């Protein structure tokens, strides 16, 4: 089991989200193409937050959601 704490829980979520996004660099600004990995990332970060009894949102989770908005969406509009 790779999840040994929230830290590793977040890595797990982040790496699974990255695996879903890399193959679609061109579609990053397309909701139909990203709504699932994105929605699935929220669910992951929140489900493990519950698992370690932390609230949601929580700092570590947002930092990660901040990350995707930097590296994946900084070039898109607000849609």
């Amino acid at each position: 089991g790779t999840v040994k704490n929230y830290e590793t829980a977040v890595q797990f979520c982040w790496n699974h989200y990255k695996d879903q996004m890399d193959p679609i660099e061109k579609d990053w600004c397309d909701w139909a193409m990203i709504s699932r990995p994105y929605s699935t990332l929220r669910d992951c970060l929140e489900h493990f937050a519950e698992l370690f009894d932390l609230g949601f949102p929580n700092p570590l989770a947002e930092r990660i959601i901040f990350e995707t908005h930097q590296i994946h969406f900084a070039n898109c509009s607000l849609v």
């Binding site: 709504s35 949102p57 929580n58 901040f66 930097q70 900084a74 607000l78």
Partner: protein, 97 residues
């Protein structure tokens, strides 16, 4: 549908948090934040923002209001129990009225 309304609301909040930060504007205020369901704009300290309840759930009343306090130190009110930034959604449930 509801999941869609939430991720969409969320993605936009963050786009703004990231791409439309308050520039200069010295003084104190609460910076834009995503409370998990609703996005809240930047506001001057000592204010109480408010909005209608999210159309997300069916036991929620869109006519009801939602509140969120930004204190005089420019920090969003935190609920005393867990002491995490807190939005007051206590009035959204239809049956609690």
């Amino acid at each position: 549908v509801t999941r869609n309304k939430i991720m969409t609301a969320q993605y936009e909040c963050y786009q703004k948090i990231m791409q439309d930060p308050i520039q200069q504007a010295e003084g104190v205020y609460c910076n834009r934040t995503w409370d998990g369901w609703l996005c809240w704009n930047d506001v001057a300290a000592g204010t109480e923002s408010m909005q209608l309840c999210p159309d997300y759930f069916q036991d929620f009343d869109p006519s009801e209001k939602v509140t969120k306090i930004c204190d005089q130190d420019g920090n969003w009110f935190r609920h005393p129990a867990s002491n995490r930034t807190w939005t007051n959604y206590t009035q959204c449930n239809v049956n609690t009225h």
